[PDB]
């Protein structure tokens, strides 16, 4: 589960500092 690719995942620290999340 990537932080921006479907299913995007923007909730954990390993995904928050991501333009597609922050």
């Amino acid at each position: 589960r990537d932080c921006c690719t479907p299913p995007k995942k923007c909730k954990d620290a390993q995904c928050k500092p991501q333009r597609c999340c922050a």
Side-chain angles (χ1 to χ4, degrees):
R1 312 98 190 334
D2 301 358
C3 308
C4 322
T5 334
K8 328 183 143 40
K9 172 156 264 60
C10 297
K11 218 289 194 103
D12 282 302
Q14 258 56 25
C15 280
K16 247 182 252 182
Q18 245 60 231
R19 64 207 180 58
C20 11
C21 294

